[PDB]
Amino acid sequence: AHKSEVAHRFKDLGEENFKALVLIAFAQYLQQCPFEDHVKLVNEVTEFAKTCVADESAENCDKSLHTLFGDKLCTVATLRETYGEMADCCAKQEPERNECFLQHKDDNPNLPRLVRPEVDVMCTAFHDNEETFLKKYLYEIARRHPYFYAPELLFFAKRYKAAFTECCQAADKAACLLPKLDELRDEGKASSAKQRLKCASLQKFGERAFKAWAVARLSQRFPKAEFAEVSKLVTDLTKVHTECCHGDLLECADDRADLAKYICENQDSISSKLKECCEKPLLEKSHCIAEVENDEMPADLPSLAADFVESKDVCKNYAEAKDVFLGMFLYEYARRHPDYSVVLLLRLAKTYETTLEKCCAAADPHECYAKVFDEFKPLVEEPQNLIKQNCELFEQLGEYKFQNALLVRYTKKVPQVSTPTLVEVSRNLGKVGSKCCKHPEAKRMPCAEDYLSVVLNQLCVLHEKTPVSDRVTKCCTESLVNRRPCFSALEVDETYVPKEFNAETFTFHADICTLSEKERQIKKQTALVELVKHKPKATKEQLKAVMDDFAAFVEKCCKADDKETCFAEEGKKLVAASQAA
């Protein structure tokens, strides 16, 4: 164990990443804090760190990272008149102060939306103070996505700098810059959502859950790798994400680097597909390994019949070490099925487990578990059916109309759920259609069913903040593996009383003419959820009818005699038809 963890981390990560990482740590705890303040605090922490690196025996160098950093956040956070319910945390010591900070993370911060300035402007600000410009990027995303995988956020910042470096010297700056930022925005939302799930698993379902998940995913990725190796990897990788989720961002970054290093110094025993990745700079390398394509599986692997049903020691080995035996089954099953979703593999693993508990406590266990594998079959076919059906539906509806289809279906299921949430979740689910139906009906399952998990988790966590439907609460709390079926099983809420008619939520304005097409869509899908809430018995024929009116008048009013008052009479037409009763 090192004396002075801050020195140890400062030396290991180096100054630039140390600062960026603390800045992320601060913004993911204090999302409402202004930029300038966080930087000042990070600067002071970094000032102090250097003293400990110089001399580890100097005054506070032996304090934990959280004590040191926590004391530092609270200088601005103790302000109750500006931050409210967050010096709740500052009244505490470590570790309870940190436990407090983690539980006050807000998945939906009431934060001002980003202005996006002219390209001229951004590029000016970039050359002027390159370092501030990047911090301002780190800060904005971190406070908006308090679960962004911090090391990966350094990677994003780096791509972000790279974009401005390249495009700000381009002949056409806009034509170069914007697609890169558009890709970066999408890739970032995806990354954030994926990490929320890794964190929710750990924090709500425990380390054992995350491990099973990783064994499964890594086994599919590295099918030539031995179990001992995968287990080692699962271990390191869990230690890393546990750290990140628990707010130990420096150790997380460090331990992820060590890992990325291990992987590359052991390529020949992991995968044949890491060659290019391990030639990249640190951030890029680590990212590349993380998203690397599955290796080819060894040819002619045997069947699992021998070890997991036919051996005489199935019950012994099970009872002799249940977790490593299940890990093995899960490893052996996942290696051989990169075409199964990670969730399917966990279900089969869970089925095999529950089947051994029942059968090892039986007269003749082998006679009892002989069937087991046959029982996996309807579990495998079930996701296949849904994906087949949803992809046909998407193929004839397109992303947008497909999202609206989900918007209506999902609103009727759980109309207490908040409108912006319904809109976000349904729009994202629509993105499975685009991302996954694209693939041949044979790689679709991991893409489709693993991504829904990420999307269903967003719903779960956005709903957790201010819960309004016990049925969502139940599906989200029940298991993690049963989330999709539990949500699929939900029936239309006939118990729910229709919302009254608010005029403003159905009146539009001249500002809508200045929005992107995407925003306009979002604007209208927002109206649609509100429509269903106000008339849940409306028909598909009726709903899509009222839809095209919204569509048509936007067109006519964005052109007409003063666009502002134009949305207004349409507001007056709808208002009069409601008072009418």
Ligand X SMILES: COc1cc([C@@H]2c3cc4c(cc3[C@@H](O[C@@H]3O[C@@H]5CO[C@@H](c6cccs6)O[C@H]5[C@H](O)[C@H]3O)[C@H]3COC(=O)[C@H]23)OCO4)cc(OC)c1O
Per CB under 6 A, residues contacting ligand X are 114-117, 125, 133, 136-137, 140-141, 144-145, 156, 181-182, 184-185, 188-189, 192
Residue 557 and residue 570 in contact, taking contact as beta carbons nearer than 8 Å: yes
For residues 192 and 220, which CB has a smaller minimum distance to ligand X in the complex?
192
For residues 117 and 281, which CB has a smaller minimum distance to ligand X in the complex?
117
Helix axes 15-29, 35-54, angle to 10 degrees: 140
Q: What type of residue sits at position 132?
A: T
Taking the complex as a whole, the smallest distance from the CB of residue 481 to ligand X amounts, in Å, to 28
For residues 141 and 288, which CB has a smaller minimum distance to ligand X in the complex?
141
The H helix count followed by the E strand count for the chain is: 28, 0
Q: Is 569 marked within a binding site?
A: no
Q: Is 246 marked within a binding site?
A: yes
3-class DSSP state of 300: coil
Q: Is 37 marked within a binding site?
A: no
Q: Is 2 marked within a binding site?
A: yes
Compute the C-alpha angle 428/431/432, nearest 5°.
105
Taking the complex as a whole, the smallest distance from the CB of residue 257 to ligand X amounts, in Å, to 21
For residues 194 and 483, which CB has a smaller minimum distance to ligand X in the complex?
194
User: How far does Cα 266 stand from its chain's mean position?
Assistant: 29
Residue 500 and residue 487 in contact, taking contact as beta carbons nearer than 8 Å: no
Q: Is 88 marked within a binding site?
A: no
Taking the complex as a whole, the smallest distance from the CB of residue 132 to ligand X amounts, in Å, to 7
Q: Is 509 marked within a binding site?
A: no
For residues 114 and 170, which CB has a smaller minimum distance to ligand X in the complex?
114
Taking the complex as a whole, the smallest distance from the CB of residue 113 to ligand X amounts, in Å, to 8
- Give the residue closest to ligand X by C-beta: 188
Taking the complex as a whole, the smallest distance from the CB of residue 174 to ligand X amounts, in Å, to 11
The conformation of residue 298, written as its DSSP 8-state character, comes to P
Give the position of tokens 């809109």: 423
Residue 359 and residue 368 in contact, taking contact as beta carbons nearer than 8 Å: yes
Whole-number Å distance between alpha carbons of 376 and 380: 6
Report the 10 Å Cβ neighbour count for 191: 22
For residues 188 and 223, which CB has a smaller minimum distance to ligand X in the complex?
188
Q: Is 337 marked within a binding site?
A: no
Residue 194 makes CB contacts below 8 A (sequence gap 6+) with 149, 454
Taking the complex as a whole, the smallest distance from the CB of residue 193 to ligand X amounts, in Å, to 9
3-class DSSP state of 292: coil
Whole-number Å distance between alpha carbons of 359 and 379: 20
**Can you say which residues are annotated as belonging to the binding site for (4Z,15Z)-bilirubin IXalpha?**
239
**Can you say which residues are annotated as belonging to the binding site?**
2, 5, 12, 66, 239, 243, 246, 248, 251, 254, 258
**Can you say which residues are annotated as belonging to the binding site for Zn(2+)?**
66, 246, 248
